[PDB]
Symmetry: D3
Subunit: 201 residues, 6 copies
């Protein structure tokens, strides 16, 4: 897990020309003021008019510098009806989440030695779920209304590996012959899938 | 921070006669079923008719066995008007919180080398705060309505050191002469304070 | 990373009825003998006549009990011409590898905040590569001969999330409507992909 | 616990204008000389003519730069007859101590799930005690002579949260109405307590 | 460093037939009583009539079960005039020490990338030293009187690798031809050295 | 073990005038290019015409900057017939190794509480061994041909404490009277041993 802190506070210095280290260097405490332990960035719903039909509003260290060294972060996710937060992985954290409104099918997948088991449940307001570090998982809005959840992590920067976008729309894309061997389908099918992720999101 | 996991899942075996280790031993996976990554325990408001005027509903490993080894937990806190979650400390975790309804004065205190600075702000629906590991902090309901928040931790068992209850109502209590020297007041004042915490909460 | 050791040696007790804990309980040292720090299991090539055209021979704690508590493990991977070790993730470790024979295209993918960049290179005998914890990566045999590599991890049990098999052949499978929304293609395409992973490997 | 070291030595650069990071940046090894692994700062007794009747002489990274990255520090504490080191907490370390002279009542308090139990014993020359990370604890000189102890920590910067000074004399102070609700006493009692800690120590 | 604790207390169960895990299983709290956080084992001087002319009195988890999970331990070392605590290594901890009486030459050796530098100083009563994790170090009594020190570690079980005893008196001994090649001297010299450590201490 | 990473990549900035921190500061990602996750430095055999009769080719962070923050490194070791990699220790890592060609006697030594037990085995092509963190170990070429192995570590900078060179050829050397007491032999024997390591390797 994230390295433990070595003092009370260490607000991230996010200037483009700051020295680079594991994590972030910190502002002098003299320059921090009173408000660094607080945020209002998750107060508003994100724009769900995206190809996925969901929107992620992040509150990692890049958006909340006061989290630097403290071992935590939070995101909000909003969903249109029938929208998905697609199969994804956090390389550097466990996630713990609560549904705030609506009805979400939440799925969590075991690794190979767990027989790739899929656990899935419809989760409603006030109900919670846990995603062990590094495992593939997804959410799907099964209600007729807009849904939203707020999720927390045991890292200041968990990372997000979106599985469809990474497989089919990386920069540059994975070669077609690699994908035909891996996916057990013809080139035409692979090229169709790539055409859907060419725009970069 | 909590030790990292060494497999996908390890649901806590909470039987009274189970072998005792750092954390908890685990149920055989054969005995776990489909639902261990989920809970509904935070769906309902706690009973705020307490001396503090607040109620803590816990979702640590004792209440959510599926969190075992995963490095996370969550609590809900509900507040009557004018109620407080009194000055307290988590010995083993950072906290990250969001206010769900109402208006809460949230205060966080630096240690001695931070000049014991008090940072405090009124936090409203959808707004967030962070409490660095081991620092004293409190919340106070400044609104006219019932308030509530949901908070997450980077530990399966953060611990709670309630400062007033521990100072004045430990089992057995701290000797009066220790408290008169520490608090710089006469025995009568110390005995008055003890009389308020004699009931154990 | 894996918890540090608290003594010199702690050979895993792998009996089916042993108590379950994070990792594994240990054999009494009296029962260990002289050979637990050694193995010959990677001396022989695996059987590459599989749908992927590669074979993974594991030397994690389940196969090498002497690694328990020590923070390391190793695997061997053998490749038929044109074979792939498909896009996969290790939830709990960084990997460091060396190619022993043949020519392998090795690809490593950044996360979202790294713009999902793909780094790829043909790696030959004696040449090395590194895969940061939790990132998607693959290998593809571009030579005319059988290839092989040996890779090490900073975990006794890194875990393997095979991306194609998990997306299309989990137990039970991810619902088709979830995959049509996530993959941006019609049901027929999703069902074709599922038909290729129905056998469980 | 503190992050592990990534090289043999890394003496803290304590200049006021040095770049700020988790912990401290290090002096070039060229500038370190022979003496950084040694100190004489705990050779002399501190001045016990304080309101508490004790004095803490610190040997954390700010006073012993050679401890940087190494995961340890030490303090000395001297006591006048009837003096106290008042109820306090270390947010980032376990403490292990030895009494060198005199007779000290040493008390350690469990958290809420430990029923807030108080363990206390008179500890004499050569006898030892342990304080688990983040728990409230105190010492009180019950002898007729000056007492002293030397204590070590598993952090280069454990932090000190002095409970009375933080509750009643933070900068600025906790509002009186918060303290009347938390302490279950009238405003006059709270104001009396504040008047004793107004001077800042 | 040692894994962090997951609860307040976890006293080691040292029975010979207890289940074996990384570290130690714990006694039920019901069986612990009031005294587990305290010891008197370092109150008395060890017997310095040994071949080394020093004696180590240990207070690791085997001797102080209350240290289990807490990340700390302590030893006392007593020295006859001209006695040595010979070149040794702690595989799993940093050490921080204080001299209590007498005059000790204390030496600390850098690794290969530190040019194998030797730092050494005569350390007297109340003066302190630090030994970074895993580095070779020694002490030698240069005074005319008995000397002693008390040292603390950031592990419950640091381990001790005594260099002369391990090189020349392991069980069974390192083969003579291995030592002649490593030490660049003839068999007769190696056999002389072995004859001095044949007794097992 | 090494601190976990807080982002995908952080290539070490090895310039002599770069700011110094635990580990290394990082190059801006803009300056990294495509090749930092790869190396060819272990492709060639080292020069075994040394006093030890072996050669270590290192691929730690100083030689492979892309390993910075990732928790891993690798070395190659080549052996002349009858050559040794002498008794040594890694202060900051476990090692996991594979023999690539030839026949090597590999020995691993327990600490004092393990009765200083020596485990040793002849290890041949494709066979593996593990060295727990901080324990003394060695290899000796018992074949008639040149041998080689490749070894991996759970640290970017494990450190190497060569026991003979450190005991007899440190900078400056350990005083002769310290070594006569520790080794239980006369000054002449100690001076003979020092004369063999005076050249610095
Ligand atoms: Mn997620
Ligand atoms: Mn709290
Ligand atoms: Mn891999
Ligand atoms: Mn203390
Ligand atoms: Mn030592
Ligand atoms: Mn080695």
């Amino acid at each position: 897990t994230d390295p433990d802190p070595l003092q009370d506070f260490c607000v991230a210095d996010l200037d483009g020309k700051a020295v680079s280290v594991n994590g972030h260097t910190c502002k002098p405490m003299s320059e921090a003021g009173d408000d660094f332990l607080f945020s209002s960035k998750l107060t508003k719903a994100g724009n769900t008019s995206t190809p996925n039909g969901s929107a992620v509003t992040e509150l990692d260290v890049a958006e909340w510098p006061g989290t630097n060294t403290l071992g935590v972060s939070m995101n909000r996710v909003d969903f249109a009806p029938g929208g998905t937060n697609p199969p994804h992985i956090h390389p550097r954290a466990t996630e713990i989440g609560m549904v705030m409104k609506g009805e979400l099918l939440v799925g969590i997948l075991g690794s190979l030695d767990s027989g790739n088991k899929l656990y899935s449940r419809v989760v409603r307001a006030g109900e919670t779920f846990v995603i062990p570090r590094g495992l593939m998982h997804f959410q799907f809005n099964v209600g007729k209304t807009e849904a939203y959840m707020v999720v927390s992590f045991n890292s200041q920067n968990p990372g997000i590996v979106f599985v469809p976008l990474t497989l089919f729309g990386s920069d540059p894309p994975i070669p077609t012959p690699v994908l035909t061997k891996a996916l057990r389908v013809e080139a035409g099918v692979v090229e169709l899938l790539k055409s859907k992720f060419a725009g970069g999101s």
